Amino acid sequence: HWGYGKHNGPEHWHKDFPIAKGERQSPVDIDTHTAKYDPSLKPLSVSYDQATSLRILNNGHAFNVEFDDSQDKAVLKGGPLDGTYRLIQFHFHWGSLDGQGSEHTVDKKKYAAELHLVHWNTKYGDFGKAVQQPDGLAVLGIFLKVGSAKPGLQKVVDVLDSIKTKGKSADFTNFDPRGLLPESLDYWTYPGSLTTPPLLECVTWIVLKEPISVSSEQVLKFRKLNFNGEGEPEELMVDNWRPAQPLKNRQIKASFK
Ligand SMILES: CC(C)C(=O)Nc1nnc(S(N)(=O)=O)s1
Ligand SMILES: CC(C)C(=O)Nc1nnc(S(N)(=O)=O)s1
Ligand SMILES: [Zn+2]
Known part of the structure; x- marks a missing residue:
């Protein structure tokens, strides 16, 4: 089964998922000088005030904070998007060292x-x-750098001990994802993939220009999670990131000059 190890990591995925070598794969390197400002791009509309978190799950690849998506409670609109996109979950990708992970x-x-x-x-x-449609998803991507703690992340950090291993979940109600955003909603956008x-x-990717800061202690706690299930040899959940893929016939657009 696919993962992030030497024998099942991103270089192997194409054997089971040939689209891995497709024309609009993600992630990509954002070359800031080549991205072009698109003045017709609208400000993002992030409407998370009514978000209803439910649960946090270690799925063996990351941890997912899941939301009630049976109504328009937490929605993303505007920017490059037509229509309304409902928040279903968030998760992170991170490194074994502060110098990698995105x-x-x-x-x-x-x-x-x-x-x-x-x-x-x-x-x-x-x-x-x-997910079967070219405009089916909008993923809002936010970079994390290590520095000051992100107070709005701490409730996530503190539950991770209860979901150490693959398949563990915990109740995770009343979490406000607004606490994970940076100040600015300036973004780059391009068409991509899961x-x-x-x-x-x-996926329509919307990647914010401003990273959030998290503390070394916060990211250290991410790195204490396990890819394995309980009772299996411990494999730290680190470096669960796919590297940048060829941009091919795509232009990255910037919402800002
Ligand atoms: C892309 C594919 C493997 C996939 O993940 N499909 C899902 N269908 N419903 C989901 S759920 N429980 O988050 O709402 S995931
Ligand atoms: C579980 C389901 C709802 C889902 O969200 N699946 C994703 N699989 N890759 C994603 S990513 N790293 O491109 O945001 S999200
Ligand atoms: Zn992801």
Whole structure:
């Protein structure tokens, strides 16, 4: 089964998921000088005030904070998007060391981690149908650098001890994802894919320019999670990131000059 190890990591995924070598794969390097400002791009509309978190799950690849997506409670609109995209979950990708961990890079720079807030286009009714469509998902990507603590992340950090191993979940209600955003909503956007199998080419990527700061202690706690299930040899959940993929016939657009 796919993972992030030497024998099942990103270089192997194409054997089970040939789209891994497709025309709109993610992540990519964001070459800031080549991205073009698009004055027709609208400000992002992030409406998370009514978000209803439910649960946090270690799925053996990352941890997912899941939301009630049975109504328009937490939605992403505007920016490059047509229509309304409902928040379903967020998760992170992170490194074994502070110098790596992000999936997208900025002028080849790797951040310590990257947050993905996953949303699906409500015109397709459910996430499973949305992933079959070229405009099915909008993923809001936010870089993490190590510095000051992010207070809004701490409730996530503190529950990780209860979901150490693959398949463990915990109740995770009343978490406000607004506490994970940076000040600015300036962004880059391009058409891409899920960065994990099945690697479907269904994502409008919206990557914020401003990283959030998290403390070394916060990211250290991410690195104490396990890829393995309970009672199996311990494999630290680190370096669960896919490297940058060829941009191919795509232009990255910037919302800002
Ligand atoms: C892309 C594929 C493997 C996939 O993940 N499909 C899902 N369909 N519903 C989901 S759920 N429980 O988050 O709402 S995931
Ligand atoms: C579980 C389901 C709802 C889901 O969200 N699946 C994703 N698989 N890769 C994603 S990513 N790293 O491109 O944001 S999200
Ligand atoms: Zn992700």
